[PDB]
């Protein structure tokens, strides 16, 4: 496969029990990946692996409102690897997005944007070959 940046419409927005699954392969020498769950121009949940931020690998999560980024949430568990296939699962729970990578729980992100049914697209960008992006209800 899919052309990146890729937009996945989320019809009717997100809801608890919605599971988003992304399969792809990290490019060689990758620098960054981003998932953006968007409410119009706002970013309800930005999930941003950085492969070299001051020679550290970190995942940064945040929300963008009226073009302003908020407080970053950082996770040093870093399950992505240059050149290698991955699976990202994002499960919407009532109070957070819950993210697992390669079947291992990674992080949770508390809902700051509370109008879940207005979060109706997911952007996928950065240094990946994107194989598939889909959703289902569990
Ligand atoms: O806080 C989160 C943000 O941090 C900074 S801005 C900032 C600085 C200090 C404190 C703070 F709160 C915010 C970044 O520049 C922000 N970013 C990253 C990408 C982006 C685009 C792409 F096309 C990709 F492919 C990609 F992987 C990432 N767009 N925007 C975002 O990550």
From Swiss-Prot:
GO terms for cellular component: cell surface; collagen-containing extracellular matrix; cytoplasm; cytosol; extracellular exosome; extracellular region; extracellular space; ficolin-1-rich granule membrane. Residues 6-136 form the Galectin domain. The modification Phosphoserine is found at residue 76. It is found in: Cytoplasm; Nucleus; Secreted. A major expression is found in the colonic epithelium. It is also abundant in the activated macrophages. Expressed in fetal membranes. A motif (Nuclear export signal) lies at residues 114-129. A beta-D-galactoside binds at residues 69-75. One of its GO terms (biological process) is positive regulation of protein localization to plasma membrane. The keyword rRNA-binding does not apply. GO terms for molecular function: carbohydrate binding; chemoattractant activity; disaccharide binding; IgE binding; laminin binding; molecular condensate scaffold activity; protein phosphatase binding; protein phosphatase inhibitor activity. Keywords: Acetylation, Cytoplasm, Differentiation, Disulfide bond, IgE-binding protein, Immunity, Innate immunity, Lectin, mRNA processing, mRNA splicing, Nucleus, Phosphoprotein, Repeat, Secreted, Spliceosome. It comes from the Eukaryota. Its main location: cytoplasm. Galactose-specific lectin which binds IgE. May mediate with the alpha-3, beta-1 integrin the stimulation by CSPG4 of endothelial cells migration. Together with DMBT1, required for terminal differentiation of columnar epithelial cells during early embryogenesis. In the nucleus: acts as a pre-mRNA splicing factor. Involved in acute inflammatory responses including neutrophil activation and adhesion, chemoattraction of monocytes macrophages, opsonization of apoptotic neutrophils, and activation of mast cells. Probably forms homo- or heterodimers. Interacts with DMBT1. Interacts with CD6 and ALCAM. Forms a complex with the ITGA3, ITGB1 and CSPG4. Interacts with LGALS3BP, LYPD3, ZFTRAF1 and UACA. Interacts with TRIM16; this interaction mediates autophagy of damage endomembranes. Interacts with cargo receptor TMED10; the interaction mediates the translocation from the cytoplasm into the ERGIC (endoplasmic reticulum-Golgi intermediate compartment) and thereby secretion. This is Galectin-3. It comes from Homo sapiens. The chain holds residues 113 to 250 of 250 of the full protein.
């Amino acid at each position: 496969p899919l052309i990146v940046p890729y937009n996945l419409p989320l019809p009717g927005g997100v809801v608890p029990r919605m599971l988003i699954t992304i399969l792809g392969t990290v490019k060689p020498n990758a620098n960054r990946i981003a998932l953006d769950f968007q409410r119009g121009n706002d970013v309800a949940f930005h999930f941003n692996p950085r492969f070299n931020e001051n020679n550290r690998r970190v995942i940064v999560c945040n929300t963008k409102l009226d073009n302003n980024w908020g407080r970053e949430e950082r996770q040093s568990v870093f399950p992505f690897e240059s050149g290698k296939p991955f699976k990202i699962q994002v499960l919407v729970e009532p109070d957070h997005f819950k993210v697992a990578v390669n079947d291992a729980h990674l992080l949770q992100y508390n809902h700051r944007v509370k109008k879940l049914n207005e979060i109706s697209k997911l952007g996928i960008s950065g240094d990946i070959d994107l194989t598939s992006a889909s959703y289902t209800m569990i």
